[PDB]
Design a protein around this ligand. Sequence first.
Ligand SMILES: Nc1ncnc2c1ncn2[C@@H]1O[C@H](COP(=O)(O)OP(=O)(O)O)[C@@H](O)[C@H]1O
Ligand SMILES: Nc1ncnc2c1ncn2[C@@H]1O[C@H](COP(=O)(O)OP(=O)(O)O)[C@@H](O)[C@H]1O
Lengths: 517, 507, 53
Amino acid sequence: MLKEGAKHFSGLEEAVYRNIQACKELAQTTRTAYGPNGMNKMVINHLEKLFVTNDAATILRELEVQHPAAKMIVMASHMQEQEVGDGTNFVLVFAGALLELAEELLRIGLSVSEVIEGYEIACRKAHEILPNLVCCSAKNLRDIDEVSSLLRTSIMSKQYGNEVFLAKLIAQACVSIFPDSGHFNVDNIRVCKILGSGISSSSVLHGMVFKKETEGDVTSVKDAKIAVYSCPFDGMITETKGTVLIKTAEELMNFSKGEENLMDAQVKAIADTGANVVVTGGKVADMALHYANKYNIMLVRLNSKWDLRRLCKTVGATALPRLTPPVLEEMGHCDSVYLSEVGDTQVVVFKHEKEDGAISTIVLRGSTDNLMDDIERAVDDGVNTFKVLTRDKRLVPGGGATEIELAKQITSYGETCPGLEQYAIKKFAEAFEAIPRALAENSGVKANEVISKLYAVHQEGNKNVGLDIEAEVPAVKDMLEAGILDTYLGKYWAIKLATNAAVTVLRVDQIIMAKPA
Amino acid sequence: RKVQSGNINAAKTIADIIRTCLGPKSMMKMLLDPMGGIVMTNDGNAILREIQVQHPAAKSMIEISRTQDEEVGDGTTSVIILAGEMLSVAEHFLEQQMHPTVVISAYRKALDDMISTLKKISIPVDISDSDMMLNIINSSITTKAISRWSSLACNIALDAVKMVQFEENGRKEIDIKKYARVEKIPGGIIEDSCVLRGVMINKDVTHPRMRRYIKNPRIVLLDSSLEYKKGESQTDIEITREEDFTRILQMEEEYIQQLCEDIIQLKPDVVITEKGISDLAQHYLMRANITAIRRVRKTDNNRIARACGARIVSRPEELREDDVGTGAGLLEIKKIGDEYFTFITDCKDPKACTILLRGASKEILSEVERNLQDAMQVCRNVLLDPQLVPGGGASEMAVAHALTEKSKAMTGVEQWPYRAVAQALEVIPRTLIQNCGASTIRLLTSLRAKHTQENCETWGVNGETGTLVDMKELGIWEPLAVKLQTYKTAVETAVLLLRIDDIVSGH
Amino acid sequence: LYISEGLHPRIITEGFEAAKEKALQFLEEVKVSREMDRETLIDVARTSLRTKV
Ligand SMILES: Nc1ncnc2c1ncn2[C@@H]1O[C@H](COP(=O)(O)OP(=O)(O)O)[C@@H](O)[C@H]1O
Ligand SMILES: Nc1ncnc2c1ncn2[C@@H]1O[C@H](COP(=O)(O)OP(=O)(O)O)[C@@H](O)[C@H]1O
């Protein structure tokens, strides 16, 4: 009319309408998960493989939204993912509940400044009262079952069938390097995929693990310097066709002898300069393997971009895809390279640990390539959850037993200070009842009776609804002795990011115009 | 579950019509006619009567409101608003899971708690003195009427109310509708209205010949069975010829002789007759030491059935020896004014006095009639229960606070509908604040924060300025039975509208 | 115009009543008497005829 060119529908009326419906529709396609349930969703983009996923991270990473209100939350989601390990759907659910509860306050007839002030006061009160429900704590990280219980509790959120063997393997792989005290890195653990048997035959191994065959000889010396290259066995001599049937044998024999002499001089110069082995990334030839066998030089076969990228980012060399024989400028720190036979396959093992910065690589094996993705996701999630950078994790009884207590505390605190700030406090307290409802609705029973039962027992804060059929209607269980706890800092960061996103959404709300060319 | 939604939609549509017609500062509606007319009025009952709907729920609500207005006479507007608010706050929020069972029990518990709270807050009063009653009547009648001669009218109405009560026997029955009417006669000074016996006689008695004067006789009225009939139960005599006409005289003479020989010892006077007037038979009837009157309408029938107690039955002769006519009754035909007036004093069934007013035109008649009506209604509503409650918007807040406290103390499962029906009682103060012209949020918050300290339940909102004032210094009080009846009617309407399943057709 | 600007009809009615009372008081205080004779009635009739015919 005066600013927009019949593109958007913004103005002095979409404040309590279009700016909330988009977020509601975005969060509606996410409440189906959140909990140990089988709600797989197929993802079809560009790979054209038809794979089903369960986590919301891969679902949100493939969906393309064209709305600023929906794009204002993916930034906070990525920030929370970069900060701590888990935590993604909680922020979205909290923001959706806050928006749905503020829609009524905006429709009644209240300004946004009072609502923002009340939300900030409620968030400050929740942050102040949060360090008060600490029950269990981490004792010694040098044991096995102490971290195995936490790993099992973290894995049970994803996979429900098998969760003990994977947790034990992750614990054994993490305890063989360095604990949380001192310094512990994350990009020092690699996951390899082996197409063979099922998942009931996995093992662990310290050092580098790569599925690369060897058609030469076993070189177990320390002077075998590595030499990575792009495509050294490509084609230094391009041969063409003269006639149709065949040409003269003299020219072909001369060209073959010249190429053989050239490659012999090349391998002699590359072996006499201080490099016994060579990393190739091309094809093979009969004379090539013959020279590699008669010169005692290890020759690989399998080539991959990820392998050379990891070798470059770990050692620090540089591939030289040149025709003329260059000089030795790829000196690294590796020296102990051994060969092993695993699953009738030849694997390499690198030994260069000096009790500092050790690496590990767990051996994984499955049926198809569409099943190891969830295993790798669970493994990396458990690895990220194990890192907390503190000796005492100060675990709290998660699963919804603390949300009701926090809501009751906020409700009891709000019924004291007079003024027009009680409605926002009551809304922030009632918004905390969105975690048990989503967990009860995704099981098979209702959620009103579960909430009534949870509010009718006692204010102990250690009661939550179970997962079996004998724990849906009563929902009276003690999760303190079972071993179901959550991260203390994770919930705090999630609440902080949700409050920040809600404040940013409620602030920027007026007229959405365009920009001139 | 779509019939209940369609019912509550029409209920809210009907309720959202006369919502802005409460309080001293009310709005004014206007209805246009299809022919080309427009009438502006501020009466909700007129709009409800002139409306035409098609939904059965709306017709049922209109009939309930009409019955409530006809039975009591005060409190027939807020019932629909309260019912609509309760419906919109309960069914339009607690029916997503379809469970119409515990809602009835919650409504019953809320009604019982409201009744208990309203009963445990009333204050006693005395009815010995008369100045307090007159002050209460003047304070309750100061709504939208003139102020010039209200004191005398209210005093006369109070006297008539205190004089019309005589049917006491343990149940306290008061009837003033069909027991006390209003009379009008122009001429004379306007400052002479009072109470009298009241006899509905204007120009019905006709005496062609001059006879004796009536001083203090003993009139014994009979029945009306002397018209153009064929006798008792057979067709042996029929009025067709002049011979039958002249034999009717002898038949009536024989009948009056039989009556005199049977049960005539106090010598009655006039008798009720519907048909029978001439210039020859009437002379013989007057000479037979008896008189007869004619021209009887519905007012005279009601007067002789209420004050005298005359019945209608097929039995003119052979009655009770002591039926009616017990006491010396004077019947002097006075010439005061311009018409014949009778003053039957001291007879059967006393305490049946009517009013006597001498105004002018029809405007004075209408104004004194409406003044007497509203004053008698106020007196009947006050004398029915000697308990007053400080209105204006102070008892509802205390009731809601008590209900919320009880719900928080019981810690039950159905606490959500209880809280929803308890928080749906602050509609009258919000409407008053909106009509006054102020903020409806800050004032409501201040009223909620004030009704929770220590001993503070008489602080309401002024209906003329827009501030919170104590009811102990203003003087706004309401009866107790009216609020209980309103709450019971609202609960019954909600229960009836909540128990509606499917609707079909039949014969 | 005052309603479109933002006000309530009750305050407008109160102000109108106050202005009417003030105008009535001013008219009652500004009145003056004059002896009725022949020239006054002649002038009144002339003004009436001029305003009519
Ligand atoms: N086995 C279990 N028992 C009880 N609660 C569980 C279990 N598994 C997961 N949860 C709950 O489900 C919630 C979501 O977990 P998760 O999916 O790991 O995080 P996010 O939803 O942020 O991705 C957690 O807050 C946790 O309390
Ligand atoms: N001076 C006053 N102060 C406070 N409240 C008042 C005053 N005058 C009237 N009201 C309120 O205005 C309302 C008028 O109700 P009314 O329209 O008579 O109901 P109905 O139409 O059912 O008879 C009363 O409930 C009373 O509480």
